[PDB]
């Protein structure tokens, strides 16, 4: 009944070392601790993924390359472009150990769910959904979401993956493109030039997986009410058509107002309504993080969502803690949306929803 929280001090220190999000893991954990939420959870130490575990998805050649460049942090290896290492995914010293740690944490959370230790297991430092079997991408070196789904598959016949990160969950969608046993649903910004460039509403998967990929392309400036209306509409239809046995939910906070990417205009309350809708299904649920580049806001978001999972109302005042001085200028838990336009036209959203409904008739 009590949610599992994947945590150890060593794991947070490892996750803190990614240069695209330095110290973020510590900020998220410190805020959760400051609100005393960890006392309401079952704290489980993550295992480190073995080569065999990582190889359930990633190719041997890619894993061996990552291991090789990780030794000295060789960021100029002849084969690195081929393997997606470069500006977004640099070959830093020890990056293999980092990858193995996050892969292992999501696998540990999935195992907790299989064993019935909990109905909800949380790995806020996971969710690296862009990585491909043989290629790093989008700050992701190992696709822990795919590894977690593959572990859950041992017990759960149909798994629903829901991806609320700002960016299209392309690595997870591609991994499961050809199967009807895992349905992927991504809501994301979709615009020419915007990473990774995929995920139009017409992208529905392939072969036996046709219609078991769902993409909801959204324009800039979306706020809580409209986002929740879209998310609820799609998830209601998906749940009815697909009848999942377990859910993996990626909650990247790069949609939240104040993110330097400045694309969506969401608050944690809106994402929380989506989370509540999914929790009401009462299925085994693996909760992951993902993007989020305003570090204090990402901690605000994931702390608030941890409160949602626990059914608790948190104080609006950020408690004093290690990183309190980073919570200005308001020092409150709530995030105020920016005063910019929502570029989502109601007719286009209607069209997208109609198209998705038509696709889901084939799953039914």
């Amino acid at each position: 009944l009590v949610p599992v929280y994947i945590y150890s001090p060593e794991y947070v220190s490892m996750c803190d070392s990614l240069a695209k999000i330095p110290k973020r893991a510590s900020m998220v954990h410190s805020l959760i601790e400051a609100y005393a939420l960890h006392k309401q959870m079952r704290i489980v130490k993550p295992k480190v993924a073995s080569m065999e575990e990582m190889a359930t998805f990633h190719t041997d050649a890619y894993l061996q390359h990552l291991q090789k460049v990780s030794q000295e942090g060789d960021d100029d290896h002849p084969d690195s472009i081929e393997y997606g290492l470069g500006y977004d995914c640099p070959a830093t010293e020890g990056i293999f150990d980092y990858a193995a740690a996050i892969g292992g944490a999501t696998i540990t959370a999935a195992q907790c769910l299989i064993d019935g230790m909990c109905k909800v297991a949380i790995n806020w430092s996971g969710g690296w959904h862009h990585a491909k079997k043989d290629e790093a991408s989008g700050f992701c070196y190992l696709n822990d979401a795919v590894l977690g789904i593959l572990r859950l598959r041992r017990k759960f016949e149909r798994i629903l993956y829901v991806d609320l990160d700002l960016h299209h969950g392309d690595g997870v969608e591609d991994a499961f493109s050809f199967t009807s046993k895992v349905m992927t649903v991504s809501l994301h910004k979709f615009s020419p030039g915007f990473f990774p460039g995929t995920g139009d509403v017409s992208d529905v998967g392939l072969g036996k997986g046709r219609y078991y990929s769902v993409n909801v392309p959204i324009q800039g400036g979306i706020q809580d009410e409209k986002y929740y209306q879209i998310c609820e509409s799609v998830l209601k239809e998906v749940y009815q058509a697909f009848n999942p046995k377990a859910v993996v939910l990626q909650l990247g906070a790069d949609t939240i107002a104040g993110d330097p990417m400045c694309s969506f205009n969401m608050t944690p309350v809106g994402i929380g309504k989506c989370l509540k809708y999914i929790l009401q299904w009462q299925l085994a649920t693996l909760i992951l993080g993902g993007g989020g580049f305003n570090l204090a806001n990402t901690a605000r978001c994931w702390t608030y969502l941890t409160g949602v999972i626990l059914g608790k109302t948190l104080s609006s005042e950020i408690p004093d803690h290690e990183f309190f001085t980073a919570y200005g200028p308001d020092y409150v838990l709530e995030i105020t949306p920016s005063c910019r336009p929502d570029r989502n036209e109601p007719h286009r959203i209607q069209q997208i929803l109609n198209y998705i409904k038509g696709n889901l008739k084939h799953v039914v």
């Binding site: 695209k20 500006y87 862009h130 030039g193």
Partner: peptide, 5 residues
């Protein structure tokens, strides 16, 4: 290939 970032 797009850049993220």
């Amino acid at each position: 290939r797009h850049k993220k970032x």
